[PDB]
Design a protein around this ligand. Structure first.
Ligand SMILES: [Zn+2]
Ligand SMILES: [Zn+2]
Ligand SMILES: [Zn+2]
Length: 178
């Protein structure tokens, strides 16, 4: 097993996966690492098993169809993993916790949004369809672009959105296009 957390790359109190070498802090894993369960398989392993059970699930899909899917267990898992893939990037620190807005020449967004809120919303089964989760994720970066205007800090939103989008296309097997 690895000696650092797969998500935040720090050591500490780690839980080790039984079917791959990854390790996690308790609340870095999504869902939070489960109390008992021996053996325990991490989210990377669980996502791999889905693909292996249904190889055809990797054929291309239309985003419109993906977004309308109900949040049954497999889609819940895939959103959890996509969220985890965003937290894996260190630049997600900017978007994790509840923002506040007081900048000359800018007004705060009408609907603030942040990663820990999406995390809670997933944990509490508040999204009925994939679209709900994706909309809140995209709102995080859209709010940031709008607020920071021409400050070069806007680029952090572009960068972390790019990570989200690449992973969304990968996890949900979106049809590749030019
Ligand atoms: Zn961690
Ligand atoms: Zn694993
Ligand atoms: Zn099959």
């Amino acid at each position: 097993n690895s000696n650092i957390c797969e998500v935040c790359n720090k050591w500490g109190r780690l839980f080790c996966c039984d079917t791959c070498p990854r390790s996690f802090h308790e609340h870095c894993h999504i869902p939070s690492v489960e109390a008992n369960k021996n053996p325990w398989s991490c989210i990377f392993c669980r996502i791999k098993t889905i693909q292996e059970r249904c190889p055809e699930s990797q054929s291309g899909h239309q985003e419109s169809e993906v977004l309308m899917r109900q949040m049954l267990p497999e889609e819940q898992l895939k959103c959890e993993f996509l969220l985890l893939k965003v937290y894996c990037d260190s630049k997600s620190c900017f978007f994790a916790s509840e923002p506040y807005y007081n900048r000359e020449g800018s007004q705060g967004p009408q609907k603030p949004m942040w990663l820990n809120k999406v995390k809670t919303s997933l944990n509490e089964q508040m999204y009925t369809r994939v679209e709900g989760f994706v909309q809140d994720m995209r709102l995080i970066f859209h709010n940031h672009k709008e607020f920071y205007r021409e400050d070069k800090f806007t680029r952090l939103g572009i960068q972390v959105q790019d990570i989200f989008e690449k992973n969304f296309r990968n996890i949900f097997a979106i049809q590749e296009t030019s």
